[PDB]
Amino acid sequence: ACDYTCGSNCYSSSDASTAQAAGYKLHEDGETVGSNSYPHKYNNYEGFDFSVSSPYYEWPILSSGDVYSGGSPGADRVVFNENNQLAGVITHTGASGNNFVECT
Numbered sequence: 001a002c003d004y005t006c007g008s009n010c011y012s013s014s015d016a017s018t019a020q021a022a023g024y025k026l027h028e029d030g031e032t033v034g035s036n037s038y039p040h041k042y043n044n045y046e047g048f049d050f051s052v053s054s055p056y057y058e059w060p061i062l063s064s065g066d067v068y069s070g071g072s073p074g075a076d077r078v079v080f081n082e083n084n085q086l087a088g089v090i091t092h093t094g095a096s097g098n099n100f101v102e103c104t
């Protein structure tokens, strides 16, 4: 079973933790990768009801199981905060334009 389902993509908690750890490390070191400069602040324009505190940062989580290193980011993202807490997993899949919807 999937802990997070982003469209057709199936993710386990371990996938989210592995992705979050990579993005958090880059955040703490003040570095970014990719043309879109990940990780970067997530403003929560969508108004998701995150239970943890801000600031929030988005980082790509890949369907292949591989850790993002600068290529195409795909549609899915893990959102984490300043205290290394997972806020949520979201996706562009099933959403209009560049909006996000939450993964189930």
Ligand SMILES: Nc1nc2c(ncn2[C@@H]2O[C@H](CO)[C@@H](O)[C@H]2OP(=O)(O)O)c(=O)[nH]1
Pocket (backbone or CB within 6 Å): 036, 041, 042, 043, 044, 045, 046, 058, 098, 099, 100
């Ligand atoms: N949809 C959305 N985009 C955000 C948010 N916070 C930052 N962004 C960025 O705002 C711009 C319009 O969506 C994009 O550059 C997007 O970054 P990403 O495209 O890297 O996600 C947010 O809360 N929602």
Ligand SMILES: [Ca+2]
Pocket (backbone or CB within 6 Å): 010, 011, 012, 015, 065
């Ligand atoms: Ca996996």
Ligand SMILES: [Ca+2]
Pocket (backbone or CB within 6 Å): 064, 065, 066
């Ligand atoms: Ca692999």
